[PDB]
Design a protein around this ligand. Structure first.
Ligand SMILES: NC[C@@H]1O[C@H](O[C@H]2[C@@H](O)[C@H](O[C@@H]3[C@@H](O)[C@H](N)C[C@H](N)[C@H]3O[C@H]3O[C@H](CO)[C@@H](O)[C@H](O)[C@H]3N)O[C@@H]2CO)[C@H](N)[C@@H](O)[C@@H]1O
Ligand SMILES: NC[C@@H]1O[C@H](O[C@H]2[C@@H](O)[C@H](O[C@@H]3[C@@H](O)[C@H](N)C[C@H](N)[C@H]3O[C@H]3O[C@H](CO)[C@@H](O)[C@H](O)[C@H]3N)O[C@@H]2CO)[C@H](N)[C@@H](O)[C@@H]1O
Ligand SMILES: NC[C@@H]1O[C@H](O[C@H]2[C@@H](O)[C@H](O[C@@H]3[C@@H](O)[C@H](N)C[C@H](N)[C@H]3O[C@H]3O[C@H](CO)[C@@H](O)[C@H](O)[C@H]3N)O[C@@H]2CO)[C@H](N)[C@@H](O)[C@@H]1O
Ligand SMILES: [Mg+2]
Ligand SMILES: [Mg+2]
Ligand SMILES: [Mg+2]
Ligand SMILES: [Mg+2]
Ligand SMILES: [Mg+2]
Ligand SMILES: [Mg+2]
Ligand SMILES: [Mg+2]
Ligand SMILES: [Mg+2]
Ligand SMILES: [Mg+2]
Ligand SMILES: [Mg+2]
Ligand SMILES: [Mg+2]
Ligand SMILES: [Mg+2]
Ligand SMILES: [Mg+2]
Ligand SMILES: [Mg+2]
Ligand SMILES: [Mg+2]
Ligand SMILES: [Mg+2]
Ligand SMILES: [Mg+2]
Ligand SMILES: [Mg+2]
Ligand SMILES: [Mg+2]
Ligand SMILES: [Mg+2]
Ligand SMILES: [Mg+2]
Ligand SMILES: [Mg+2]
Ligand SMILES: [Mg+2]
Ligand SMILES: [Mg+2]
Ligand SMILES: [Mg+2]
Ligand SMILES: [Mg+2]
Ligand SMILES: [Mg+2]
Ligand SMILES: [Mg+2]
Ligand SMILES: [Mg+2]
Ligand SMILES: [Mg+2]
Ligand SMILES: [Mg+2]
Ligand SMILES: [Mg+2]
Ligand SMILES: [Mg+2]
Ligand SMILES: [Mg+2]
Ligand SMILES: [Mg+2]
Ligand SMILES: [Mg+2]
Ligand SMILES: [Mg+2]
Ligand SMILES: [Mg+2]
Lengths: 248, 231, 56, 120
RNA sequence: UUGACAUUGUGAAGAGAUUUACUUAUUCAAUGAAGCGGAGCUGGAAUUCAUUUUCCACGUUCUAGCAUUCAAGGUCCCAUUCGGGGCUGAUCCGGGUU
RNA sequence: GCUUGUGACGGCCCGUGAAAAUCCACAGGAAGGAAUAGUUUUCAUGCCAGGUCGUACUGAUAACCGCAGCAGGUCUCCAAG
RNA sequence: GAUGGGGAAGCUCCGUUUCAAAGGCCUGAAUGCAGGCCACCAUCGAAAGGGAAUCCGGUUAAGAUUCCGGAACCUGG
């Protein structure tokens, strides 16, 4: 046989991300004396669009605590954050949209974005346009909150971990139908080259396990094991069950 | 005075860029610096076996500097000191004076390892000085168990390099004398009996007990304030 | 063009005011004012919160 | 005791960096001056065209060391033929030899000095 | 992928004819390795074996300013024509960067 | 009217449309600073110098590729009635 | 794509600010000590990208925004 398409992607080459026109990385401010004890103030200087990301970025200046200089940060704008507003950052900071706080420092029910999985990693969960995570409870022991992630699975993280108050801008972006091949073409021109996608059942047997011909059919179960080997994994991979669900 | 004003800076979160402070604890140190500090701590933690931990019992500078002062009048023959005794006595005795009798019998501090051990094996020395800092530590540790069984009184001392300046060199490890001066018989057996106190006879107690432990600062105040306060 | 500015007299590269180049006019005007209003209200906030410090 | 570390960023201390005391030279004798003035200007270019430039343009056309820049040329042109050199334009002929167009100032006649070198 | 053996140290219970101590190996994360760990200053109630008696606070939030010169002030030395040094300003103690 | 540049604008995106060298400017106040004088070289004028390699010509039904002076292939500027 | 480095029997592989003690400016006292700031970072990579600055007229068998005549400009002293 050949090396199927989904193997060739881990070598980089063609399949690397298209990064040129991006803003910087979107990261919180470093977790320091400022945010850990008091709070800090900075102006969101502009929000702005980041290529291949559908979730506008907010550029927040801060004043360097330990030297006289300005320090710019790249935050993911939270829907209602606005140019000129004052962002407050720390455990003593208030509860308001745009502010970044420790998680134990909010009451349960609070909704938050860009939330760190462990303290000071400068944010992971709910970065995408229109995402949020709700704090479902706290702990006396071991600085633990517990939160429900956008996937719906609840995960228990450190009450010292941060997150910014709100839910990311960029709204209902996926409601609008792509409507055209070209609209999906430019979608991925600025992201990575996964598009368009040729169907494995349409290839020859050399190119894909599906590629058996003479009719177009997969010919053996489309559900592959987890212990399967690189080059056999195509189709429904760990699939627990299959078919149309209708599960609300 | 009142052409001026008193304008205190707020030096607190949100204002007034912090003043220079002593970061000497926070400094990111060169790698070699890190290890030598961290090699200590590693040896400070864990559990030291008895025969290794039998050191760190050292001689207080009181007994030390006085012991050293005894040894310090016994310095072995030096560079120019060997020019005199040789080119004179090897001349004056050449065809003339008596063989080996033309120069006086010496008294010195008798240095080197296989030197010192062979003595202690043959019971020809009285006071031994074994320095605490020797890498490898195996070059020594057998002696305190050997010096007891051979009945030679010994002293674990500071200054592997301190014992060296006594002997003219940079470093020493073992330094032990043998004969001494007929007058100094007092101090030696005064040293022997007060040095037999800490490490000679008390040594068999040092063995039974091990060493190690030392949770260190942040872990100490954690266990104290846990069990010993409230928990 | 950028390097031509090292060939030109300084009475081009600026005008006469605080922030002669850089920020313009109404923005330097708004600069002054907004400073003064917060500096005042600072004093006001120190004292009104130093009086509820005192008599209680 | 202690010391005040004002910064937590460590840096390599400065150190004397002694000068060099060789003890045996390198070379036996320094190289004599390669590319001297009798090298630089190599030979005249006497072609009928360059010739017409002598009796009109007040320019002396010379083959030159490929290694000789416009300074070396002008210095060695002055030194050898004892004249003031206005300007110097050098190309490299197709054959891989440099041709220099050396203009003499108003104070001199290029045709005179030409057949003072004995070509005319 | 699963088991074993070795990297592999220190502890405690409670079970058969397995749950969880500790940090120094090793593993991850952050930093231009700044503010950790313990104790103390001052302010309020704890309150009456009128104290050792614990808890609490202990610099920034109407504003699209400003924030840098080992710090002004205060308090000591020097002969100080002019600048010059110590400590305070900014508690202490450990050097375990978090 | 043609080509073309510029001024003011309108629309398009789940596409919002390089980087660095370089140059000027501001805030700041370290500093030097005059009277029988000391100040400024971002105002005018005046002095000297600027190396090295390339530079021809074809660029195509003959100068490149395609065994060739091959009906093929090979990026671009100017454009009259 | 070197460098502390970490792989690989090795030819070599990874890495480009990383688990590194990674410096080079301006001033005074003809040159060292005393000042002092500042310090994440070799280099290669565009004859269509960025970019200091020239024009006209004349001239050859064959070169010219290059030569000549005239008029300029830019960088560096
Ligand atoms: N991925 C590119 C990013 O560019 C960013 O830089 C942003 C700005 O600093 C930069 O702005 C440039 C400016 O540098 C340059 N000196 C002048 C230029 N007109 C500006 O351009 C920008 O602003 C103008 C006016 O609003 C717009 O017309 C233009 O479309 C826009 N790109 O353009 C970016 C915004 O478009 C950051 N350097 C960084 O996040 C990253 O490198
Ligand atoms: N159009 C906006 C919304 O899009 C979603 O609908 C889409 C998805 O729900 C559904 O699944 C798509 C999947 O087909 C497509 N190949 C990839 C996409 N990520 C999937 O979406 C799915 O996974 C994402 C996470 O990846 C989950 O957050 C989401 O709940 C889930 N439905 O495919 C639908 C389109 O074919 C909403 N479920 C739907 O109610 C609504 O139309
Ligand atoms: N932008 C201000 C106006 O620009 C006008 O001229 C502008 C327009 O002709 C043209 O601007 C177009 C605009 O027409 C059109 N409707 C929107 C488009 N984005 C603009 O383009 C401009 O901005 C984009 C960034 O979005 C830049 O990447 C691009 O280089 C820039 N020309 O480019 C010019 C420079 O921006 C006039 N000068 C005047 O009316 C006024 O100054
Ligand atoms: Mg194959
Ligand atoms: Mg990439
Ligand atoms: Mg494609
Ligand atoms: Mg599809
Ligand atoms: Mg398809
Ligand atoms: Mg087929
Ligand atoms: Mg197959
Ligand atoms: Mg098939
Ligand atoms: Mg078929
Ligand atoms: Mg068929
Ligand atoms: Mg079909
Ligand atoms: Mg089918
Ligand atoms: Mg199969
Ligand atoms: Mg014991
Ligand atoms: Mg002006
Ligand atoms: Mg040339
Ligand atoms: Mg020729
Ligand atoms: Mg295994
Ligand atoms: Mg097991
Ligand atoms: Mg085990
Ligand atoms: Mg017409
Ligand atoms: Mg684009
Ligand atoms: Mg300017
Ligand atoms: Mg100014
Ligand atoms: Mg030409
Ligand atoms: Mg030509
Ligand atoms: Mg043509
Ligand atoms: Mg042809
Ligand atoms: Mg051909
Ligand atoms: Mg044709
Ligand atoms: Mg053709
Ligand atoms: Mg074509
Ligand atoms: Mg490489
Ligand atoms: Mg590294
Ligand atoms: Mg020097
Ligand atoms: Mg170019
Ligand atoms: Mg021509
Ligand atoms: Mg001319």
């Amino acid at each position: 046989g050949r090396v199927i398409r989904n193997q060739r992607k881990g070598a980089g080459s063609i399949f690397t991300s298209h990064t040129r026109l991006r803003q910087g990385a979107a990261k919180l401010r470093t977790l320091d004396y400022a945010e850990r004890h008091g709070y800090i103030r900075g102006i969101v200087k502009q929000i702005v669009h980041d290529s291949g990301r559908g979730a506008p970025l907010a550029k927040v200046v801060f004043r360097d605590p330990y030297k006289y200089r300005l320090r710019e940060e790249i935050f993911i704008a939270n829907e209602g954050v606005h140019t000129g507003q004052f962002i407050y950052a720390g455990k003593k900071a208030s509860l308001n949209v745009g502010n970044v706080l420790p998680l134990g420092s909010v009451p349960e029910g609070t909704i938050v974005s860009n939330v760190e999985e462990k303290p000071g990693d400068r944010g992971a969960l709910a970065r995408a346009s229109g995402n949020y995570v709700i704090i479902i409870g706290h702990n006396p022991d071991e600085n633990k909150t517990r939160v429900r992630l956008p996937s719906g699975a609840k995960k228990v993280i450190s009450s010292d971990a941060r997150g910014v108050i709100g839910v990311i801008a960029g709204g209902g972006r996926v409601d609008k139908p792509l409507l055209k091949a070209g609209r999906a073409f430019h979608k991925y021109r600025l992201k990575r080259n996964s598009w368009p996608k040729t169907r494995g059942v349409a290839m020859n047997p050399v190119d894909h396990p599906h590629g058996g011909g003479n009719h177009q059919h997969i010919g053996k179960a489309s559900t592959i094991s987890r212990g399967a080997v690189s080059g056999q994994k195509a189709g429904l991979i760990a699939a627990r069950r299959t078919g149309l669900l209708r599960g609300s | 005075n009142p052409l001026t004003h008193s304008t205190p800076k707020n030096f607190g979160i949100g204002q007034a860029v912090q003043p220079k402070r002593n970061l000497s604890r926070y400094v990111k140190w060169p790698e070699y610096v890190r290890v030598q500090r961290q090699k200590k701590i590693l040896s400070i933690r864990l559990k030291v076996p008895p025969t290794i931990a039998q050191f760190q019992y050292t001689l207080d500078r009181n007994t030390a500097a006085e012991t050293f002062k005894l040894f310090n009048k016994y310095r072995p023959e030096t560079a120019a000191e060997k020019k005199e005794r040789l080119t004179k006595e090897a001349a004056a005795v050449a065809e003339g004076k008596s063989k080996q009798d033309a120069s006086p019998k010496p008294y010195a501090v008798k240095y080197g390892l296989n030197h010192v051990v062979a003595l202690i094996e043959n019971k020809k020395a009285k006071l031994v000085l074994i320095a605490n800092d020797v890498d490898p530590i195996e070059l020594v540790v057998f002696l305190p168990a050997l010096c007891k069984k051979m009945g030679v009184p010994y002293a674990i001392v500071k200054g592997k390099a301190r014992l060296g300046t006594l002997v003219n060199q940079k470093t020493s490890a073992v330094a032990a004398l043998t004969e001494v001066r007929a007058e100094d018989e007092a101090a030696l057996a005064k040293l022997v009996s007060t040095i037999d106190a800490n490490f000679a006879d008390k040594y068999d107690e040092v063995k039974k007990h091990w060493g190690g432990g030392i949770l260190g600062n942040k872990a100490q105040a954690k266990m104290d304030k846990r069990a010993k306060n409230s928990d | 063009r950028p390097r031509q500015y090292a060939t030109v007299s300084k009475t081009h590269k600026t005008v006469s005011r605080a922030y002669g180049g850089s920020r313009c006019a109404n923005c330097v005007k708004e600069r002054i004012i907004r400073a003064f209003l917060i500096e005042e209200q600072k004093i006001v906030k120190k004292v009104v919160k130093e009086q509820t410090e005192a008599a209680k | 005791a202690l010391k005040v570390r004002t910064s937590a960023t460590f840096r390599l201390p400065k150190t004397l960096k002694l000068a060099r005391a060789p003890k045996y030279a390198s070379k036996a004798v320094p190289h004599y001056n390669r590319l001297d003035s009798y090298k630089v200007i190599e030979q005249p270019i006497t072609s009928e065209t360059a010739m017409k430039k002598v009796e009109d343009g007040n320019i002396l056309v010379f083959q030159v060391s490929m290694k000789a820049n416009k300074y070396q040329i002008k210095k060695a042109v002055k030194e050898l033929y004892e004249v003031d050199v206005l300007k110097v334009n050098t190309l490299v002929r197709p054959n891989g030899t440099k041709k220099a167009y050396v203009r003499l100032t108003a104070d001199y006649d290029a045709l005179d000095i030409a057949n003072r070198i004995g070509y005319i």
